[PDB]
Ligand binder design. Structure first.
Ligand SMILES: [Ca+2]
Ligand SMILES: [Ca+2]
Ligand SMILES: [Ca+2]
Ligand SMILES: [Ca+2]
Ligand SMILES: [Ca+2]
Ligand SMILES: [Ca+2]
Lengths: 66, 66
């Protein structure tokens, strides 16, 4: 539980409770940069279950457990 | 505002209220592909004022007025 909470806080740079596309790019750049910016956009869309353009904590956890 | 909303909705294909770099690439491919992949990403970064990697309607209107 706190494991994912801590990791989410690391990815959420401005502390607004959401991971943005740019925040997800930073995450991917720091783990080998396997994707292009366009592809990170697609990753962000698939993770954004409720479609508000943001990845919240519940959406992060569903991804992390898959 | 009618026309600005119309254009924003065409570009925001996945309907999350933002225009990604991926969506901008589709738009520019549909308009003849005048720009390289990198140039589209540069255009997106120019339009994305607050740096979250996502172009909201406010940022879209600002750029259209430039
Ligand atoms: Ca943080
Ligand atoms: Ca954030
Ligand atoms: Ca969401
Ligand atoms: Ca969109
Ligand atoms: Ca610039
Ligand atoms: Ca933005």
């Amino acid at each position: 539980e706190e494991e994912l909470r801590e990791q989410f806080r690391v990815e959420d740079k401005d502390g607004n409770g959401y991971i943005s596309a740019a925040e997800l790019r930073i995450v991917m750049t720091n783990r080998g940069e396997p994707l292009t910016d366009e592809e990170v956009d697609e990753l962000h869309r698939e993770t954004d279950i409720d479609g508000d353009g943001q990845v919240n904590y519940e959406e992060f956890v569903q991804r992390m457990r898959a």
